[PDB]
Amino acid sequence: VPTEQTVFMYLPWSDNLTSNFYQNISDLESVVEKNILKDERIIIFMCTTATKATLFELAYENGKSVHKTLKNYTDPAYTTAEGITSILNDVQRYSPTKRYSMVIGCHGMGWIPVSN
């Protein structure tokens, strides 16, 4: 019954960092293996293609890390406010906690507008 914190790792489509993201997840799993998530959950949204994504939990069970798949997405609208809100509402439904944090992996260009 963890209720204190959800760490949400958000990995929208990056074109060419997908493999790097898998290694990021593997690295984070090596921490879950140490049984640190008694009051917290780790929830991950990852685009496996530009149009396909999965939401899953990293948890510690029977002395090991485990991926619990929560749902899949087809054509998620992750570049839109409504799409991001809907994903975050999914995170909250699967993981009701007092606090939330967000880890965002992708290419970055600061404040620069998409439309220039």
Partner: peptide, 4 residues
């Protein structure tokens, strides 16, 4: 060598 690639960056993000």
């Amino acid at each position: 060598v690639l960056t993000x």
